[PDB]
DNA sequence: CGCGTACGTGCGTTTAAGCGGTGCTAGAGCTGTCTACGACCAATTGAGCGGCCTCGGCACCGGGATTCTCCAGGGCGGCCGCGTATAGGGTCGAT
């Protein structure tokens, strides 16, 4: 259930890619062990009807 | 200390208090007679007071009912505040 689409320069995850936070997450250890490029997500989400 | 008003003060208008002069008689005050009522004395009698006793109306109280007295706590709104997020600026790397 970890699926990543890879073709040319396009990379998009079809399953899981969003961290639920680093506080108390063993994935932070994983990110320090495996070359993970983590990017913060701004919670601003406008809505269009 | 501050606000609001009610009473002091002045003036023009208006009422009756005061003066006093005069006349009338009602009622106070004086007087003269006659007596009904009160003081005063004596003898008799019971109404009123000290004493003595018994007894219950109320002082005393422990329990129970009540009638106030005070407050205390929970809820609800406001104000401040710690944490997280988000935008902005600055810095570093790449073209």
From Swiss-Prot:
Provide the tissue specificity.
Ubiquitously expressed.
PTM annotation: Acetylated by KAT8 in epithelial but not in mesenchymal cells, thereby regulating the epithelial-to-mesenchymal transition. Acetylation by KAT8 reduces KDM1A association with nucleosomes, thereby decreasing histone H3 demethylation, leading to transcription activatio of target genes. Polyubiquitinated by JADE2; which leads to its proteasomal degradation. Deubiquitinated by USP38; preventing it from degradation by the 26S proteasome.
Q: Where in the cell is it found?
A: Nucleus; Chromosome
The protein's induction, as recorded, is: Down-regulated during neural differentiation in neuroblastoma cancer.
What span is annotated as the signal peptide, if there is one?
none
Which purpose does this protein serve, as stated in its record? Histone demethylase that can demethylate both 'Lys-4' (H3K4me) and 'Lys-9' (H3K9me) of histone H3, thereby acting as a coactivator or a corepressor, depending on the context. Acts by oxidizing the substrate by FAD to generate the corresponding imine that is subsequently hydrolyzed. Acts as a corepressor by mediating demethylation of H3K4me, a specific tag for epigenetic transcriptional activation. Demethylates both mono- (H3K4me1) and di-methylated (H3K4me2) H3K4me. May play a role in the repression of neuronal genes.
Subunit structure as annotated in this protein's UniProt entry: Component of a histone demethylase complex with RCOR1. Component of a RCOR/GFI/KDM1A/HDAC complex. Interacts directly with GFI1 and GFI1B. Interacts with INSM1 (via N-terminus). Component of a BHC histone deacetylase complex that contains HDAC1, HDAC2, HMG20B, KDM1A, RCOR1 and PHF21A. The BHC complex may also contain ZMYM2, ZNF217, ZMYM3, GSE1 and GTF2I. In the complex, RCOR1/CoREST strongly enhances the demethylase activity and protects it from the proteasome while PHF21A/BHC80 inhibits the demethylase activity. Interacts with the androgen receptor (AR).
Q: Which disease is it linked to?
A: Cleft palate, psychomotor retardation, and distinctive facial features: A syndrome characterized by cleft palate, developmental delay, psychomotor retardation, and facial dysmorphic features including a prominent forehead, slightly arched eyebrows, elongated palpebral fissures, a wide nasal bridge, thin lips, and widely spaced teeth. Cleft palate is a congenital fissure of the soft and/or hard palate, due to faulty fusion. ACTH-independent macronodular adrenal hyperplasia 3: A form of macronodular adrenal hyperplasia, a rare adrenal defect characterized by multiple, bilateral, non-pigmented, benign, adrenocortical nodules. It results in excessive production of cortisol leading to ACTH-independent Cushing syndrome. Clinical manifestations of Cushing syndrome include facial and truncal obesity, abdominal striae, muscular weakness, osteoporosis, arterial hypertension, diabetes. AIMAH3 affected individuals have low fasting cortisol and ACTH, but excess cortisol is secreted after eating.
Name of this protein: Lysine-specific histone demethylase 1A
């Amino acid at each position: 259930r970890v699926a990543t689409f890879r073709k040319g320069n396009y990379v998009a995850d079809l399953g899981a890619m969003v961290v639920t936070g680093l506080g108390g997450n063993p994935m932070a250890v994983v990110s320090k062990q495996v070359n993970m490029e983590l990017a913060k997500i701004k919670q601003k989400c406008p809505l269009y009807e």
